[PDB]
Design a protein around this motif. Structure first.
Motif, mmCIF file in Angstrom:
data_model
loop_
_atom_site.group_PDB
_atom_site.id
_atom_site.type_symbol
_atom_site.label_atom_id
_atom_site.label_comp_id
_atom_site.label_asym_id
_atom_site.label_seq_id
_atom_site.Cartn_x
_atom_site.Cartn_y
_atom_site.Cartn_z
ATOM 1 N N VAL C 32 0.329 -1.618 0.085
ATOM 2 C CA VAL C 32 0.157 -0.160 0.354
ATOM 3 C C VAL C 32 1.083 1.291 0.171
ATOM 4 O O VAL C 32 2.293 1.078 0.271
ATOM 5 N N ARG C 33 0.078 3.081 0.106
ATOM 6 C CA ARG C 33 0.710 3.719 -0.228
ATOM 7 C C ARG C 33 1.643 4.002 -1.428
ATOM 8 O O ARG C 33 3.278 4.086 -0.884
ATOM 9 N N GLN C 34 1.360 3.575 -2.337
ATOM 10 C CA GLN C 34 2.090 3.515 -3.494
ATOM 11 C C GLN C 34 1.209 3.520 -4.970
ATOM 12 O O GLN C 34 -0.036 3.268 -4.815
ATOM 13 N N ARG C 35 1.490 3.566 -5.316
ATOM 14 C CA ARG C 35 0.798 3.559 -7.266
ATOM 15 C C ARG C 35 2.491 3.644 -8.324
ATOM 16 O O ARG C 35 2.200 2.618 -9.266
ATOM 17 N N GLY C 36 3.695 3.919 -7.947
ATOM 18 C CA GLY C 36 4.082 3.809 -8.757
ATOM 19 C C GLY C 36 4.977 2.547 -8.628
ATOM 20 O O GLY C 36 6.173 2.150 -9.075
ATOM 21 N N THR C 37 5.427 2.296 -7.022
ATOM 22 C CA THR C 37 6.277 1.617 -6.541
ATOM 23 C C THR C 37 5.825 -0.138 -6.960
ATOM 24 O O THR C 37 7.054 -0.639 -7.592
ATOM 25 N N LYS C 38 4.628 0.357 -7.093
ATOM 26 C CA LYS C 38 3.924 -1.124 -7.772
ATOM 27 C C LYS C 38 2.744 -0.253 -8.707
ATOM 28 O O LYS C 38 1.437 -0.110 -8.232
ATOM 29 N N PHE C 39 3.217 -0.301 -10.304
ATOM 30 C CA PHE C 39 1.492 0.404 -11.081
ATOM 31 C C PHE C 39 0.704 -1.195 -11.497
ATOM 32 O O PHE C 39 1.002 -2.536 -12.028
ATOM 33 N N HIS C 40 -0.367 -1.224 -12.042
ATOM 34 C CA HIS C 40 -1.543 -1.671 -12.210
ATOM 35 C C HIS C 40 -1.940 -1.462 -14.084
ATOM 36 O O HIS C 40 -1.732 -1.500 -14.872
ATOM 37 N N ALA C 41 -0.795 -3.230 -14.131
ATOM 38 C CA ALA C 41 -1.156 -3.530 -15.444
ATOM 39 C C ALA C 41 -1.519 -4.828 -16.273
ATOM 40 O O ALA C 41 -1.183 -5.479 -15.518
ATOM 41 N N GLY C 42 -1.542 -5.038 -17.879
ATOM 42 C CA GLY C 42 -1.339 -6.216 -17.996
ATOM 43 C C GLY C 42 -2.734 -6.932 -17.306
ATOM 44 O O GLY C 42 -3.784 -5.613 -16.820
ATOM 45 N N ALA C 43 -3.360 -8.343 -17.842
ATOM 46 C CA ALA C 43 -4.312 -8.815 -17.667
ATOM 47 C C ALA C 43 -4.470 -8.160 -15.953
ATOM 48 O O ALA C 43 -6.525 -8.499 -15.417
ATOM 49 N N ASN C 44 -3.978 -7.809 -14.795
ATOM 50 C CA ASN C 44 -4.052 -7.890 -13.584
ATOM 51 C C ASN C 44 -4.087 -6.064 -13.878
ATOM 52 O O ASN C 44 -3.571 -5.153 -14.736
#
Ligand code: MG
Ligand code: MG
Ligand code: MG
Ligand code: MG
Ligand code: MG
Ligand code: MG
Ligand code: MG
Ligand code: MG
Ligand code: MG
Ligand code: MG
Ligand code: MG
Ligand code: MG
Ligand code: MG
Ligand code: MG
Ligand code: MG
Ligand code: MG
Ligand code: MG
Ligand code: MG
Ligand code: MG
Ligand code: MG
Ligand code: MG
Ligand code: MG
Ligand code: MG
Ligand code: MG
Ligand code: MG
Ligand code: MG
Ligand code: MG
Ligand code: MG
Ligand code: MG
Ligand code: MG
Ligand code: MG
Ligand code: MG
Ligand code: MG
Ligand code: MG
Ligand code: MG
Ligand code: MG
Ligand code: MG
Ligand code: MG
Ligand code: MG
Ligand code: MG
Ligand code: MG
Ligand code: MG
Lengths: 96, 50, 79, 64
Positions: C32-44
């Motif tokens: 949590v407390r992120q968007r850039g640390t891990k971005f929502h992409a692909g089938a996910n």
RNA sequence: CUUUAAUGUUUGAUGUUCUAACGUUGACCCGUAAUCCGGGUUGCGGACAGUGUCUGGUGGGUAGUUUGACUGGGGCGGUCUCCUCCUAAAGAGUAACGGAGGAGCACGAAGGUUGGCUAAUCCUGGUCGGACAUCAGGAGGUUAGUGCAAUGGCAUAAGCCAGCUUGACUGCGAGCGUGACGGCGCGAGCAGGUGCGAAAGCAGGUCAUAGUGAUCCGGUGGUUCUGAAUGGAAGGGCCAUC
RNA sequence: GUUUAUUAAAAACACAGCACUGUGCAAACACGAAAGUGGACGUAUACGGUGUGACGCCUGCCCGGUGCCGGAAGGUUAAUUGAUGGGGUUAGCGCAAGCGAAGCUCUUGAUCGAAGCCCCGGUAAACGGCGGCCGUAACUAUAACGGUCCUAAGGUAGCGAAAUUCCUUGUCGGGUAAGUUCCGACCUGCACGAAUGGCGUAAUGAUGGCCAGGCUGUCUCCACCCGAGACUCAGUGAAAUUGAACUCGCUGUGAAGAUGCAGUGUACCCGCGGCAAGACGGAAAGACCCCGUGAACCUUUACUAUAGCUUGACACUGAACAU
RNA sequence: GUAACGGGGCUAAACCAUGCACCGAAGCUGCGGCAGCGACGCUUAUGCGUUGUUGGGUAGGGGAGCGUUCUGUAAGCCUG
RNA sequence: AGGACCGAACCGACUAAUGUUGAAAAAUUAGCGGAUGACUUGUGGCUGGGGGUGAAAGGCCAAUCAAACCGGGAGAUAGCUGGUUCUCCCCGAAAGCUAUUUAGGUAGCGCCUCGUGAAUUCAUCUCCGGGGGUAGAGCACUGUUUCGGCAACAACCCGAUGCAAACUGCGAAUACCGGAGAAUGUUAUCACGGGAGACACACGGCGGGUGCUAACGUCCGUC
RNA sequence: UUUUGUAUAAUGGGUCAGCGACUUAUAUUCUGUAGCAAGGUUAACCGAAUAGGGGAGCCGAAGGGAAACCGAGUCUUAACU
RNA sequence: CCAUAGGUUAAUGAGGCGAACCGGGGGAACUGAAACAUCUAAGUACCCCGAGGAAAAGAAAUCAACCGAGAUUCCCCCAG
């Protein structure tokens, strides 16, 4: 129930009550029966005398146990729509 | 605190209602906004809100 | 004296490193407390309120790096 | 003498199809306005004993 | 009938007088050549006092008890729940009376969607405008902003402005994460009805993570679930909520 | 005079004297569920309670707080009585919706209500209290003296380094060759002070402190001697303690202070009289300290109760009259 | 009380490099023996020989037994 | 005359020594105080336990007293201390987490044992796929820091030099997670169920907080 | 014995002999074991007493829902998912 | 005045003791609640009175449920 000092499980959890006060006088006959209701006609009572209900009972169902064979006719009683079949399927009849 | 609890009642005869808080100390206007009324299973105009 | 206190567990991290069984929607990363640390992409995608990298359709996990300016980005191709 | 049943427990538990009991979820009768309906919605139904405390339940209800 | 009376009559509030309950530790008589006690007479007092039941006050006189834990012995001081960073050895998680801060809320918009916008700061040139307002350009580039701590995040902006709105909807939920447990969290998708948009689509409260109290006992609304002969009803259950 | 029988005889208790306060006698009060009894066969020059403790000179200011005394007009208030409105039921009404009388019930509490408390006044030989910043001065100074701010009011007489002074062996004087004690002063009283009495006081005291003369083996420094033990013999004949002993010193080691471990030194076997450095010697499941959701007794404006005291209502409890 | 190699004593009996040999434990091997499990001859219930392997142990769990008093089998058996 | 004076009896108990397994469960010896008074003594009586009595010390109430002695409720309660008895065989812990008027106690989980199930489950090595911001390093950023350069004493900026747990424009070993494979390992693995004990750990190595990079110190991670 | 740890200068015991501490009743759940089996089993009591009789009754073959109720389904829900 | 009170006499009966069980009057605390007031222990222990071989209880102003049962007492169930 004691577990150190913390609110016991039978404490932290709510208490959903209310007892039928009727289902106690409502038996549950099974298809395995009837063939022992002393002859035909499964009278509202009889089953009691047949030692399989309770002098106190006032209501009861037939339910599907998986038997019947002999043509029997339940009297003054209730029965599932799945039991009111095999019963007649064996040449039986329903009172209602 | 100063945020009292409010009870949004349904305009329909149904006794259904919603719950939330409001700051009557500055918003005296009785709140209304329309929501879903499970009873009638149809959206409607909910009222009552200090 | 003032000095003390501290938050509790609050795990938040990678619970589905690289390709995995990736069920209907494991986690793949609850950092949590992120968007850039891990971005929502692909089938996910998903990326729930608490910025939790959802992870849709079953399959493997990729863990990539695309688009202008680094940007991690996670997704789950078929397996 | 016949074992006495912990009345308190026999009012929060109920043996199920088998060993299980299934109880009533907590946090659903006080301060509910500030609680997520989604949360409370997932609290109305019943649930089996966590197995970890199941041992206890099967002690206060010797005649369960 | 409606205001104020007059007698009547009732019934309370006082307050006087009476005797006849009741008191008498005044006097006398008899039981009795007893100071007791009882009966009698007389005097005094008198519906008072006093006693029973109920009730407000007072009540360490007496009685039963309570009066926490952590703690570099105890005490003093401080602390006790929740959030943020470091400690923490690049998964999770970790201790100290370790080093530093915050929360007990706030918003009917500071929520939703659609449409549009993008800073801080410096230089230069401009009425009153100066350190520092507003204006013009240039440099600059998330150093701004974020309702409130800290961390992570944010330009497709979450940051800013406006139109229209109420998805801060109801029932459910594949599958996960996190807890000894109670429980807490994330959640695509389905059903009903909303809203915003031309549309794809987005919305089940706020950028996220603090803003909190289990159970019991009850209060309120709803329900034809139950309701001790039967019909109701009280009560109980269930749902919402204090 | 009295006291902790068995570590405290005192400065403690008591005392005569003083003061306050209660009590009109079937006294107050105390023992007692009550009867009854003591107080007292006394009666305010009496009796009880409380504090101070001969006597001398005295006993200041504060009634805000608590207590007690008086007031008790007004505000609040118990039981009691029960207005009034609401509900359940149902005769009837009605195709039905619902409405529903009377009765019975469940609830609601108008209203009536004493003491108490609030409120008004008093009271300190009642429980008690008696000032802070610091105000303005021989170099600075320093701020006892006392401005100002606030108190219920801010310690009067007397006393003061004291049975009270922390700094402390304060400073000075006296005594001594030398005096943290002692006596006399100063006052800077951490934190004296006027019946939880102030300052004195002849006499008294197995009372605390200081000094002196006499006196001495108290001591310099111990010597001799007379008796009871100790030592010897004969008879009787204990004790605590005790895991087992073939029971040495040292230095190191070690659960951290060794007869027993390591190294080493030493040492023929066993008594008797003496001494106490060690056997963490003997004795008592440490009394100090902490802990136990242990105990006891004691305190109080801790909590909850209760005897007692006290309030009103109804009962035993009746007849009239005036308003 | 030597008391800062355990001692003696050592000029190498110290130290450094290199090399071989040897002492050294309840470790390893050898020989004999016991028990649990797997294996083979097997046999062929069973059960033993050959063998691989396992056998320190507090709290505590599991599994086998010894002995004691009394009852039946005992009017038996043993016994002056 | 006198709670008057000296002093026997009589009453008392201030001092010292001795006694302390005593002659004695408070005495002996030498001194000491009162000794016509609130004096002292004999006999009998009356007050009874939360009660008595007390010239007040909690003193005395039969060698007992901040609540007597005796019998009973009674085998009070004791999360504390001690103790727990014959033999052989197998396995074998914990001294942690989280709650707790909890902290030397308990309870769920963890670890032990026993039974029953189930898979190439589980482990090592190899290889493959991962996220990482620790060590280190560095100084753009956040701060801190010098030395020079363009400031009627100096920041900003520029070049040269360092420092950092709460700095990061870099970045390991390595641990961890998942996939495939061989071998080995009496299933070592997971699940459920009968019985547990254990939640005082200690030292040494390595990484650290704290302490003095003091302690046979203290608090963690890990072997 | 207690402890992280005891030759410990920490506890206990002078020695011997005899005695001295996980029992019992009922209830509930497991494991072994025997009986019988979708059935098993009686209680008091009678008694021709360890028989035989007595099946009042208890447990199991049906569960879900708070319950009415339904039933191999049933709740949840307007939803037959 | 009466009449009672009181007095004497006589005949009857009581008195006291005793193991439990039984009926009645009065009635603890330790303890448990991991503390403690409600609650528990428990109408127990204990004190007191009375009675019999037994006591007590007892012939429905009982219960059931629209079918009916038919005093009391004791046992097994119902049911922790
Ligand atoms: Mg039957
Ligand atoms: Mg008390
Ligand atoms: Mg008690
Ligand atoms: Mg403590
Ligand atoms: Mg980490
Ligand atoms: Mg300008
Ligand atoms: Mg926020
Ligand atoms: Mg004297
Ligand atoms: Mg004495
Ligand atoms: Mg003395
Ligand atoms: Mg005095
Ligand atoms: Mg005065
Ligand atoms: Mg001298
Ligand atoms: Mg002087
Ligand atoms: Mg004084
Ligand atoms: Mg005096
Ligand atoms: Mg001799
Ligand atoms: Mg001799
Ligand atoms: Mg030594
Ligand atoms: Mg001697
Ligand atoms: Mg000693
Ligand atoms: Mg001790
Ligand atoms: Mg060799
Ligand atoms: Mg060898
Ligand atoms: Mg072994
Ligand atoms: Mg005299
Ligand atoms: Mg004399
Ligand atoms: Mg006498
Ligand atoms: Mg005595
Ligand atoms: Mg008892
Ligand atoms: Mg005992
Ligand atoms: Mg608590
Ligand atoms: Mg570094
Ligand atoms: Mg790591
Ligand atoms: Mg513990
Ligand atoms: Mg511990
Ligand atoms: Mg540790
Ligand atoms: Mg240590
Ligand atoms: Mg120790
Ligand atoms: Mg020893
Ligand atoms: Mg013996
Ligand atoms: Mg208790």
């Amino acid at each position: 129930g004691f577990e150190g000092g913390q609110m016991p499980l039978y404490r932290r959890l709510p208490k959903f009550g209310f007892t039928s006060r009727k289902a106690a006088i409502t038996a549950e006959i099974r298809l395995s029966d009837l063939a022992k209701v002393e002859g035909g006609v499964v009278d509202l009572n009889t089953l009691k005398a047949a030692n399989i209900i309770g002098i106190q009972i006032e209501f009861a169902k037939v339910i599907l146990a998986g038997e019947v064979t002999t043509p029997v006719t339940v009297r003054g009683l209730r029965v599932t729509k799945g039991a009111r079949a095999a019963i007649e399927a064996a040449g039986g009849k329903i009172e209602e | 605190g100063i945020r009292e609890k409010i009870k949004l009642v349904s305009s329909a005869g149904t006794g259904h209602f919603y719950t939330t808080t409001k700051n009557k100390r500055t918003k005296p206007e009785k709140l209304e906004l329309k929501k879903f009324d499970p009873v009638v299973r149809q959206h409607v105009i909910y009222k009552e809100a200090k | 004296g003032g000095s003390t206190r501290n938050g509790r567990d609050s795990e938040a991290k990678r619970l589905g490193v690289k390709r995995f069984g990736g069920e209907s929607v494991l986690a793949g990363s609850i950092i949590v407390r992120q968007r850039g640390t891990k971005f929502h992409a692909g089938a996910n995608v998903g990326c729930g309120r608490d910025h939790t990298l959802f992870a849709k359709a079953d399959g493997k996990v990729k863990f990539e790096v695309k688009g202008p300016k680094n940007r991690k980005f996670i997704s789950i191709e078929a397996e | 003498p016949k074992i006495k049943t912990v009345r308190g427990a026999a009012k929060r538990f109920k043996k199920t199809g088998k060993g299980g009991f299934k109880h009533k979820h907590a946090n659903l009768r006080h301060i509910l306005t500030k609680k997520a309906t989604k949360r409370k919605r997932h609290l109305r139904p019943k649930a089996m004993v966590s197995k970890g405390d199941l041992g206890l339940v099967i002690a206060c209800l010797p005649y369960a």
